[model samples]
Target: EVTPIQQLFLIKELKPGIARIGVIWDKNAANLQRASAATGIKVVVAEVASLQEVAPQFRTLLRDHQVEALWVLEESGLLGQAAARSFLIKNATQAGMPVFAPSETWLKEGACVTWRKIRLVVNKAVAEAMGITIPAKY
Candidate 1:
């Protein structure tokens, strides 16, 4: 599903067997850090000057063996680069590296999900592959 503003709250509600959630964000995004810190969840930071470097930045995260899912805090344009990543493009289903975009179209393009005014279920296949069963009413 698309991620919502209160994603941590939703994740808590869903209780997806997640003890430790990780995210990537610019260090300067105070809201990102504030929310994450408030939740007290473990995080791995990848600092960047622009969204243009997200693909490589993620690669570094993978190389360092970070977390399971990725909560991307970049702009919408970063979605295109994220979609082009070899890991996400080739192993999206196999590995479950979903993009948390800001809109449904980005999710539809391949982001596992996005959350804006409400959650958007973008790639059903990704959800199923990750063993996250969604109810019909969603």
Candidate 2:
């Protein structure tokens, strides 16, 4: 989830027109840039190490870098909070830009794209009858 690989594809698949994506993360600069080049989407990074700094840095990305969309990177520990998610969406929308988030909470808060992790349990009993063994937890 820390890698930008998955989110980049999600953006390319949906908002393929986006050429520049802005992010607020103190680390993973290389991961973002690495994925950006492969996806042909430019990444504008704002390395703010704290929550209170997010707003100014975010607006700076839009204003200075002219980023066309927001990439809610998995860093920024508490940005996952509903209030923070809502803040980004609210501003991004006003700028006529989209936000690609890494959590379902962002999607529920109206972001266009986000990732979901699922846990599917294997039927141990069925596996036993089928002459198969998982040997451990699914």
Candidate 3:
């Protein structure tokens, strides 16, 4: 039910404007940067080993005043429920920022308008948490 490539495709499809995308990588996340280069979005990294490191890594990013938002993939084992990504959305929203997630589950939990099969229903609760307004076409 979960697909990493599909998530990446969606992120590419839903490219927001001038976003500083945060990714956990080593030494500037070169590959991610290259992938994002044509997308016209800035790639901001929070070099970390796992998703458990997200909060701390995010905290460091906050302290460093880097990244306008985060695009979290499932790499750090923080994709589904019980993952702290929802917290990132909560905190980032309170701080007036956006936290994007790769999986529909996370989006269903809270991120923004995510694309899934037409038969699926979007989670209104998460939209409420992030204060996101879903467009009619979605």
Candidate 4:
């Protein structure tokens, strides 16, 4: 799915009986509501503007909110750092909480599951050269 939150159906396939998921996105809080409404599952959002603040917010979701899964949203490479990803994984292990990561690298880093989206760019010239007609939206 183009929207990350739309993947909730896929999550249900992997984790049966999941209701609430946690995530911290450095963007509009309204988006969280939209995701919850669209997916029909509770989404617990932890507010944070920086990587350093993530640990506390993560704890809040895991402890206070009691979320069953953690969704690691992309944040301009902040969560991609080795140190950041390591501690997050370490903390999750104790609670036995599953994590839904962004991509293959995160999966290798011990994320319970990963759902990735790839952006493919098609060159108009190349397509025309092959007698193919590209979509106008491209």
- Top candidate (lDDT): 2
Q: Could you give candidate 2's per-residue lDDT for residues 36-114 as a string of tens digits?
A: 8889998887876556777888899988898988887673465755666777888887887766666656655656555
Model 4, 45-134: lDDT tens digits are 776766688788888897788788777766345576677777776677566766666665655666665544633223334224323343
| Candidate 3, 1-117: lDDT as tens digits | 334344443455444454556654432232354556656566666766555676788777667756666666553343343656566767676666555555566655556644444
Q: What's the TM for model 4?
A: 0.71
* lDDT measured at residue 20 in model 1 versus the true structure, 0 to 100: 50
Model 2 lDDT, residue 86, Cα:
77
> Judged by lDDT against the true structure, how good is candidate 3?
0.55
What TM-score against the true fold does each predicted structure earn?
Answer: 0.63, 0.71, 0.59, 0.71
The best-first sequence of candidates by lDDT reads 2, 4, 3, 1
Q: What TM-score should be assigned to candidate 3? A: 0.59
Give all candidates' CA lDDT scores.
0.53, 0.66, 0.55, 0.64
Please give the lDDT score for candidate 4: 0.64
Provide the lowest-lDDT 10-residue window in model 2.
118-127
Alpha carbon lDDT of residue 110, candidate 1?
Answer: 61
Clashing pairs in 1: 2-114, 2-115, 2-120, 3-114, 3-115
Compare candidates 2 and 4 on lDDT and give the better one: 2
